[PDB]
Amino acid sequence: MVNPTVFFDIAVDGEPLGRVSFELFADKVPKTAENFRALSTGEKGFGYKGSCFHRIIPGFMCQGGDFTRHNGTGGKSIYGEKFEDENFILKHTGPGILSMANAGPNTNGSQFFICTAKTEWLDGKHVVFGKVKEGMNIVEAMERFGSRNGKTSKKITIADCGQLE
């Protein structure tokens, strides 16, 4: 009933930076929220712990979750390699939005992005399923390590992750 909260403990070239927590809109997008939750806890045997934010573009987004190929071309969901676009009820309204990366319709896996700007052109193309709750300052710090082309100047990892409450 209460939307779940998950956390990511971020590191920069292995040095602790801080924690980002997320509210998952399980009330609106339960299937997509459950995937992210489960990958954050690692309860299926695979997930985000130890993965990186491979593409960070200041003024746009931080993308991560590719734990199979480490570069944006991989990832898998708890439902199989890919799963459908659940719905598009929620919109990309500004910094802090959590949304699924994809490679075409109905291609959600594990990759996700955190918006650091309003990205309204993604509405109806990418499934929004959560938002940063605490630690937007940490996101902003991460963002500083990105670049126009998205390559990071230091390696930005999820040192630990899981569920709160």
H/E stretch holding 131 reads: strand 128-134
Say which residues have a Cβ less than 8 Å from residue 46's Cβ, sequence separation at least 6. 39, 67, 76
Stretch that binds ligand 938, among 29-37, 53-61, 71-79, 142-150 (CB under 6 A): 71-79
Among residues 19, 28, 82, 125, the one that binds ligand 938 under rule CB under 6 A: 82
Q: Is 68 in the site for ligand 938 (CB under 6 A)?
A: no
Q: Is 73 in the site for ligand 938 (CB under 6 A)?
A: yes
The reply to whether 17 belongs to the active site is: no
CB under 8 Å to 73, separation ≥6 — which residues? 66
Q: Which is nearer to ligand 938, 22 or 83 (CB)?
A: 83
Instruction: Give the interface size with ligand 938 as a residue count (CB under 6 A).
Output: 12
- Cα 112–Cα 116–Cα 118 angle in degrees, nearest 5: 100
The answer to whether residue 112 forms part of the interface with ligand 938 (CB under 6 A) is no
Give yes or no for a contact between 111 and 69, defined as CB atoms under 8 angstroms apart: no
Nearest residue to 127 (alpha-carbon basis) of 36, 56, 64: 36
Any contact of residue 103 with ligand 938 (CB under 6 A)?
A: yes
Catalytic residue among 55, 90, 112, 129: 55
In terms of Cα–Cα distance, which of 73, 64, 39 is closest to 142? 64
Which CB sits closer to ligand 938, 12 or 56? 56
Among 32, 35, 40, 111, binds ligand 938 (CB under 6 A): 111
The contact set with ligand 938 (CB under 6 A) reads 72-73, 75, 82-84, 101-103, 106, 109, 111
